[PDB]
Design a protein around this ligand. Structure first.
Ligand code: ALP
Length: 243
């Protein structure tokens, strides 16, 4: 109860509309400045890389050790003018690498797969390398936590080793034997801009707590806030304490 209060007091800083959803395989809990956001579907943005990677590896469109060579065309961030493996690109949010992946998957296979796994509204439109960045694909924060919780538990409808590979692409840090897995997202090409920070905390016992920060974004917002806010919540909840 007071834990739940200590979490809300963090959201007093946050002028933006936000929601923080947690899941432990039984109960969904909601926190933030605007709770209806948990039931609302938004474009997945870079959080789709999780599903994309899974779909690609499952269908032999790539390997986890394969290197996606840079084409020489300067990308949106100078950081992306480089060669990447799916894991390195996952950490760096290298959009062009996953665009290449989506193109290799193709629109037919991408459609059937998203339908098979029930990922959000399962709509891709006509551009197989754009749907997650500008719609029509949408997904709710509740759908994100249930999806990412299953990845943690190896319960998604994919090969164990495929789920394993994508899981470790999301690894951030550990404290004791509690491990933090996460993925950030910023739907920059839509009004309103959507900000994501989706993941889970794996406690060595075997118990997992999946999480999903979903908030309103604006031009010029601090890129580090989403993660930082999420860690501040995970600390106050007792799921992932600071040192
Ligand atoms: C994916 O959500 C975007 C591409 O539009 C990339 N990821 C962002 C993020 O996770 O913070 C970015 C601002 C690095 S760009």
């Amino acid at each position: 109860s007071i834990i739940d209060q200590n979490v809300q007091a963090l959201f007093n800083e946050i002028s933006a509309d936000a929601v923080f959803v947690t899941y432990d395989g039984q109960n969904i809990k909601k926190y933030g400045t605007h709770l209806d956001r948990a039931k609302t579907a938004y474009i997945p943005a870079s959080t789709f890389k999780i599903a994309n990677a899974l779909i690609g590896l499952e269908n032999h469109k790539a390997t986890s050790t394969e290197i996606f060579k840079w084409d020489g065309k300067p990308r949106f961030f100078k950081a992306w003018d480089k060669d990447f493996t799916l894991g390195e690109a996952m950490q760096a949010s290298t959009v062009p690498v996953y665009q290449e992946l989506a193109r290799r998957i193709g629109p037919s296979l991408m459609q059937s797969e998203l339908q098979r796994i029930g990922y959000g509204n399962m709509q891709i439109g006509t551009e197989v390398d754009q749907f997650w960045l500008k719609g029509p694909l949408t997904i709710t924060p509740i759908q994100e936590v249930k999806f990412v919780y299953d990845l943690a538990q190896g319960q998604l409808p994919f090969k164990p080793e495929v789920q394993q590979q994508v899981k470790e692409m999301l690894y951030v840090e550990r404290r004791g034997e509690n491990r933090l897995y996460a993925k950030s997202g910023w739907g920059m090409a839509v009004d309103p801009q959507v900000g994501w920070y989706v993941g889970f905390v794996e406690k060595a016992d075997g118990q997992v707590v999946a999480f999903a920060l979903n908030m309103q974004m604006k031009a010029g917002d601090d890129i580090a806030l989403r993660k930082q806010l999420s860690l501040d919540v995970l600390d106050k909840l007792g799921v992932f304490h600071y040192l």
